[PDB]
């Protein structure tokens, strides 16, 4: 999701009556599910022999 506010009339912003600032933001959701966890293998080793 992308929200863009460009400088100008769209940012009247009483605390700044000229609207010389703008911004843009991105936002999303994420989730993870696992089926059959026994099918994933991990080996933890040291490096650099």
């Amino acid at each position: 999701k992308i929200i863009t506010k460009r400088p100008g009339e769209a940012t009247a912003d009483r605390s700044d009556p000229y609207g010389e600032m703008g911004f843009m933001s991105i936002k999303w959701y994420y989730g993870f599910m696992v089926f059959r966890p026994e099918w994933i293998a991990l080996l933890k080793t040291v490096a650099r022999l």
Binding site: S15, D16, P17, Y18, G19, E20, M21
Partner: protein, 50 residues
């Protein structure tokens, strides 16, 4: 004066903000009214025998 005008000009930067505010005023004017008059008196004998 040139110096005072230059030193108080409304300059603006990139960020803007609450940087320049002004105001306005009004006043009132009045009027009045007065009454004047005067009168005169006389008698009848001071008219017929003149």
């Amino acid at each position: 004066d040139v110096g005072n005008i230059t030193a108080k000009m409304p300059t603006l930067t990139e960020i803007g903000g609450r940087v320049n505010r002004v105001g306005f005023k009004r006043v009132e004017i009045k009027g009045k009214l007065e009454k004047y008059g005067f009168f005169r008196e006389y008698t009848q004998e001071q008219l017929d025998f003149d």
